[PDB]
């Protein structure tokens, strides 16, 4: 009857979306999938009524909420929390055991990031190191944050970086695709593999990333904490760089939001973590090639929760994280 258009940003993603399309062809709200080059092309397409929805990291919810787009988060991913579940996660910095540098010794190291402008992979680590005085950046007029970061680290893999060569030097893949936002070393799992393969000394990822990727070998890794110590991977509640809002589905502020939520509400009922189907909407998490990870929704999401309609992107991210992204922008 009514169709919603999901906007995807990679070929494994479009494939996953088209599999869900085939499984919901008999539902009152059906699905079709369009694929774009980047999440930004998807924000443009949705604001242009060529697509209806996409899940975005908190840093990208920020951009989606800006004029001329003015898309709003309509549903948030929920992650497992010791006390039930939460719509937030922790940004951590993962290093290997037996290297011995602290957060104060990061100058000249190589680094692995989920993507330019993402919460855990960029906004939180780069924003924190500017605040601590480690990365010297004197405002946007002084040039880009990319330039300041490429001065700090000796080389990096930062998917989506465009000004600095050095920020794509450590990425794996074809020349044309190695530093793309859907490259091999992109996302939480991609940045973890960049560290595992020795292409970075530190990977800026989230609290579930080592479990999702090397659960057997997680004691070969540890976390770099803000107080200068190193703690085990499971000690992220006391060794994290920030708690950030969950990834969220964004949409135009118009009446299609109810069709999108009814579609999502039913799809996680049928294909959620307790599904009897072979199709999983969320993950499952576990070792597999990183380009197959966090497709449509993160592998670590366990449910979607409706966001109150009165929350826009600023209220969703919170005033403090919103002004932190505005000050690096
Ligand atoms: Fe994220």
UniProtKB/Swiss-Prot annotation:
Residues 4-329 form the Transferrin-like domain. It is found in: Secreted. Induction: Up-regulated by dietary stress. Increased expression at day 14 in the magnum of the oviduct in the corticosterone-fed laying hens (at protein level). Different forms of hen transferrin are distinguished by their carbohydrate composition. Ovotransferrin and embryo serum transferrin but not adult serum transferrin, have bisecting N-acetylglucosamine. Transferrin secreted by embryo hepatocytes in primary culture is marked by the presence of (alpha1-6) fucosylation of the core N-acetylglucosamine. Serum transferrins also differ in the number of attached neuraminic acid residues. In both embryo forms, sialylation occurs on the Man (alpha 1-3)-linked antennae. Disulfide bonds join 7-42, 17-33, 112-194, 157-171, 168-179, 225-239. Hydrogencarbonate 1 binds at residues 114, 118, 120-121. Fe(3+) 1 binds at residues 57, 89, 188, 247. Expressed in the magnum of the oviduct (at protein level). Transferrins are iron binding transport proteins which can bind two Fe(3+) ions in association with the binding of an anion, usually bicarbonate. Responsible for the transport of iron from sites of absorption and heme degradation to those of storage and utilization. There are two forms of hen transferrin, ovotransferrin, found in the ovoducts and, serum transferrin, secreted by the liver. Serum transferrin may also have a role in stimulating cell proliferation and is regulated by iron levels. Ovotransferrin has a bacteriostatic function and, is not controlled by iron levels. Belongs to the transferrin family. Monomer. This is Ovotransferrin. It comes from Gallus gallus (Chicken). The chain holds residues 23 to 351 of 705 of the full protein.
């Amino acid at each position: 009857k009514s169709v919603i258009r999901w906007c995807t940003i990679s070929s494994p993603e479009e494939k996953k979306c088209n599999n869900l399309r085939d499984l919901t062809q008999q539902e009152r709200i059906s699905l079709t999938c369009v694929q774009k080059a980047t999440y930004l092309d998807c924000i443009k397409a949705i604001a242009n009524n060529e697509a209806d929805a996409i899940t975005l990291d908190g840093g990208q919810v920020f951009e989606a909420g800006l004029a001329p787009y003015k898309l709003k988060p309509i549903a948030a991913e929920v992650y497992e929390h010791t006390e039930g579940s939460t719509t937030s996660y922790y940004a951590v910095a993962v290093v290997k055991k037996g290297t011995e540098f602290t957060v104060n010794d990061l100058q000249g190291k190589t680094s692995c990031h989920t993507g330019l402008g993402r919460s855990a992979g960029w906004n939180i680590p780069i924003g924190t190191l500017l605040h601590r005085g480690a990365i010297e950046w004197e405002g946007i007029e002084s040039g880009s944050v990319e330039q300041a970061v490429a001065k700090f680290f000796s080389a990096s893999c930062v998917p989506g970086a465009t000004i600095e060569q050095k920020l794509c030097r450590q990425c794996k893949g074809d020349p044309k695709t190695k530093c793309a936002r859907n490259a091999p070393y992109s996302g939480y799992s991609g940045a973890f593999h960049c560290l595992k393969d020795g292409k970075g000394d530190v990977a800026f990822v989230k609290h579930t990333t080592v479990n999702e990727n090397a659960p057997d070998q997680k004691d070969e890794y540890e976390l770099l904490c803000l107080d200068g110590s190193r703690q085990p991977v499971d000690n992220y509640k006391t060794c994290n760089w920030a708690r950030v809002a969950a990834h969220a589905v964004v949409a135009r502020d118009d009446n299609k939001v109810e069709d999108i939520w009814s579609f999502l509400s039913k799809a996680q009922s049928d294909f959620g973590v307790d599904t009897k189907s072979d199709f999983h909407l969320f993950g499952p998490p576990g070792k597999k090639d990183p380009v197959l990870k966090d497709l449509l929704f993160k592998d670590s999401a366990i449910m979607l929760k409706r966001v109150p309609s009165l929350m826009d992107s600023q209220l969703y991210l919170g005033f403090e994280y919103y002004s932190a992204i505005q000050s690096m922008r």
